[PDB]
């Protein structure tokens, strides 16, 4: 799958 994962800018 070529899904979007979070850009991890916030958590």
């Amino acid at each position: 799958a070529r899904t979007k994962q979070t850009a991890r800018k916030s958590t």
């Epitope: 979007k4 979070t6 850009a7 991890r8 800018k9 916030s10 958590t11």
Partner: antibody, heavy 121, light 109 residues
Framework: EVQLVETGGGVVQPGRSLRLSCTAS????????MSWVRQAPGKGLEWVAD????????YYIDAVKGRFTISRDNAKSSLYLQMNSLGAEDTAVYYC??????????????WGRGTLVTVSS | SYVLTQPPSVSVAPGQTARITCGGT??????VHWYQQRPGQAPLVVVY???DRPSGIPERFSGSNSGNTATLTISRVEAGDEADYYC???????????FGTGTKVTVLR
Amino acid sequence: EVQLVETGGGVVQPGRSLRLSCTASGFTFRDYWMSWVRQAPGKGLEWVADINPDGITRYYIDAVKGRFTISRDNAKSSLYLQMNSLGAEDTAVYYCAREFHSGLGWHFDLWGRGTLVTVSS
Amino acid sequence: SYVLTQPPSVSVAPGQTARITCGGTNIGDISVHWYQQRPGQAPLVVVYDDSDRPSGIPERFSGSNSGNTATLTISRVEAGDEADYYCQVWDDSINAYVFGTGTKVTVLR
């Protein structure tokens, strides 16, 4: 003086291509994330794409996927937007914007005057 | 794609206090920024990181964010505050900057 100057705007026929340039001056350009933000006449703000300082990380909205490509020349202090397969939904003023982060969140702390892009025959 | 709901209009008498709403599910958990846009002008940040104020921005602009609503507050509204105001977040799920639809400040007379 700290400013951004968009250029390369104008009239383009549907299906055709346009390349925008943004020239930065007055600050260290290679230190910042840079974005393109657009605004259709009488409408709201829409972020388009952005690129990281090294030029390897890039994000796009779905509306411009596979049509728009963002790039930068850190030596020229310049940002570029390559726009292919334009339609009327792309007609807008295009803004060059600098991104700001300070351990909390991301916003735009600098804008150019914008360049008008008219997609019409 | 995360949704920000703004009222299209806010009315205020001169010298009074304007309140502009940005609505989102748990928008209090994420940071919100505010832009003023005058006619024919590029947008300008007036509040960032929920409540912080850029240098050069008058103290009349303040911000807050809690629960499901962020709020831009403009106190003693004067000549020059008549403008469009946009709330903004970064959606870290689909990875895009998101703007509100915008709120026009109208002066009551």
